Design a protein around this ligand. Structure first.
Ligand code: K
Ligand code: K
Ligand code: ZN
Ligand code: ZN
Length: 383
């Protein structure tokens, strides 16, 4: 197995995106998330095995492959950039929120550092784009992007949920620009629905979006991504919401996620036949996230195995990007597991006793609802 065919992307630029209130306690999407991951990768000796990359900033043009020109200028530029912008655009930015902690925000949760957040967000997006391009060109096998802030809630002209630019969707679009007619699968295993991703590709048959998320009948952030949302127009069939229903009791974890993979993710993915797989790799379905932040019990090994299964697709062209998840031990364990798998470590599904257990009935119900909906579009789902 060729060495240095797995990329890692990280850069200290992304640490500077911090509220001015200087308190990681009211702001779970904090710099410590990516630093702890980075060092863990070094400790367990995985970093040395990978072609490490720094990343770079996305260009405003790259940003605009997904986001409106107004969104890009708002979050992608700084007063006062060396930028050559016309006065009409300058005047627009003159036309244009306070947080409890006194820092500036886009909303309650989503903080804005006036010096550093634009560079950090652009850097997250360009880093995922760049890592991906390498995989597309066949110049790396797969890879893992250790990035913040996260991306998957940012829509065409909306920053929300800790996200400003949809790094994964931007990488998707860029890849497609650079290799005509390629087919891209985006798997989102972050516990939240990636509303911005679903909306970006909703009418687009060239991109298959599969999200697994806690849904509970519209009552978990962000409220989006019901099972009946399949895509529209040309893209009808190419949006798959594994919308988990029914809450936290009973316990949602490994047998549910493994079952979701066996039954829905893998069969639909193979039928689609993706040229490349991008993963919105949030770790907030990991054990270590209380009720309001998740409430699930997925294990690091399971994230590792899910990574491992996705490597059977697309010739192996697989790129994970960090999304949500903030319990440091949980996110570091999961990141480690995923990077071993990328390298070519194989998990022993027989190693784990709790993986002998049947998925819970809520999970079964939830998957039945997926099958029922998606039978219309996928053969593997027919009957
Ligand atoms: K998700
Ligand atoms: K699509
Ligand atoms: Zn603050
Ligand atoms: Zn999340």
């Amino acid at each position: 197995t060729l060495p240095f065919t797995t990329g890692l992307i990280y850069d200290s630029v992304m640490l500077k995106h911090q509220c001015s209130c200087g308190d990681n306690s009211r702001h779970p999407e904090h710099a410590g998330r990516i630093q702890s991951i980075w060092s863990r990768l070094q400790e367990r000796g995985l970093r040395s095995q990978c072609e490490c990359l720094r990343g770079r900033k996305a260009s405003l043009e790259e940003l605009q492959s997904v986001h409106s020109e107004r969104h890009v200028l708002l979050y992608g530029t700084n007063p006062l950039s060396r930028l050559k912008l016309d006065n009409g655009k300058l005047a627009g930015l003159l036309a244009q929120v306070m947080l409890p902690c006194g820092g500036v925000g886009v909303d309650t949760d989503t903080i804005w550092n006036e010096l550093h957040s634009s560079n950090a967000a652009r850097w997250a997006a360009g880093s995922v784009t760049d890592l991906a391009f390498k995989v597309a060109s066949r110049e790396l096998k797969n890879g893992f992007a250790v990035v913040r802030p996260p991306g998957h809630h940012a829509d065409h002209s909306t920053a929300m949920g800790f996200c400003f630019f949809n790094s994964v969707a931007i990488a998707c679009r860029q890849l497609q620009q650079q290799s005509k007619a390629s087919k891209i699968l985006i798997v989102d295993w972050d516990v939240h629905h990636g509303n911005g991703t679903q909306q970006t590709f909703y009418q687009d048959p060239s991109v298959l979006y599969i999200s697994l998320h806690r849904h509970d009948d519209g009552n978990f952030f962000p409220g989006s991504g019901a099972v009946d949302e399949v895509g529209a127009g040309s893209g009808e069939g190419f949006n798959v919401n594994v919308a988990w229903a029914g809450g936290l009791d009973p316990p949602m974890g490994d047998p549910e996620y493994l079952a979701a993979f066996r039954i829905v993710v893998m069969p639909i993915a193979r039928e689609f036949s993706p040229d490349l797989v991008l993963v919105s790799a949030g770790f907030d379905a990991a054990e270590g996230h209380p009720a309001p932040l998740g409430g699930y019990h997925v294990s690091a090994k399971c994230f590792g195995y899910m990574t491992q299964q996705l490597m059977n697709l697309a010739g192996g062209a697989v790129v994970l990007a960090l999304e949500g998840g903030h319990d440091l031990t949980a996110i570091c364990d999961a990141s480690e597991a995923c990077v071993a798998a990328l390298l070519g470590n194989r998990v022993d599904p027989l190693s784990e006793e709790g993986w002998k257990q049947k998925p819970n009935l809520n999970a079964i119900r939830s998957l039945e609802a997926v099958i029922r909906v998606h039978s219309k579009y996928w053969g593997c789902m027919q009957r």
